[PDB]
Amino acid sequence: FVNQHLCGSHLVEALYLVCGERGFFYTPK
């Protein structure tokens, strides 16, 4: 599900699912 354009909340949702307990940082810059 990760090999597409992921924008806005959909990108943050993908990071949440992939990273799991590792957490993540979201820096749109």
Place this chain on the structure above:
Amino acid sequence: GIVEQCCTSICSLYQLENYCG
């Protein structure tokens, strides 16, 4: 950054994992 790699271009699992803690 992540928007340029995953939103304005097609994302990848490698790119997403770059941002995991």
